């Protein structure tokens, strides 16, 4: 439980730096902009996760069905295995049945 | 976001206040101390 003896340099953060000032800027783009582009397109991320949501099982099964054949051998394997495990666990376990 | 308990130190010390005057190994080691302190209160 021995704890840090010397004060760290206080991290100074300008909340006024570019990215933070400009946060959430185009959020209303569809509405204010006579909808053409959806808020979705403001999402920069992993191919299969854009404008979508799900629990682990759905995520995984999705990554598979989308990028599956572009994955490395080993990751792929671990993915199929995680899938199986999850199948078994969500369907076949719980308190609530 | 891996998060840990920094302050575990005080958590212990707040028990150990009361464990000071005990005889034996009861007055330091947190396990034994806890129990002793319960019986005491």
């Amino acid at each position: 439980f021995h704890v840090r003896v010397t004060l760290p340099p206080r991290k100074v953060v300008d909340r006024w730096n570019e990215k933070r000032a400009m946060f959430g800027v185009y959020d209303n783009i569809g509405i204010l902009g006579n909808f053409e582009k959806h808020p979705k397109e403001l999402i920069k991320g992993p191919i299969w996760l854009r404008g979508w949501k799900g629990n682990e099982l759905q995520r995984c099964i999705r990554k598979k069905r989308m990028v599956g054949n572009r994955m490395f051998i080993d990751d792929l394997h671990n993915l199929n295995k995680r899938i199986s495990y999850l199948y078994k666990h969500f369907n076949r376990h719980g308190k609530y049945r | 976001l891996r998060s840990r308990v920094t302050d575990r130190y005080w958590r212990v010390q707040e028990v150990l206040k009361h464990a000071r005057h005990f005889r034996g190994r009861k007055n330091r080691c947190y396990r034994l101390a806890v129990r002793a302190v319960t019986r005491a209160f």
Partner: peptide, 26 residues
Amino acid sequence: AKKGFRAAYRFQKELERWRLLRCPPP
């Protein structure tokens, strides 16, 4: 390296408390 300032700082108060027990000031 993202730590508790809470940890360090709160510890400092102990550190000085003991500084006050081992040398009591005039």
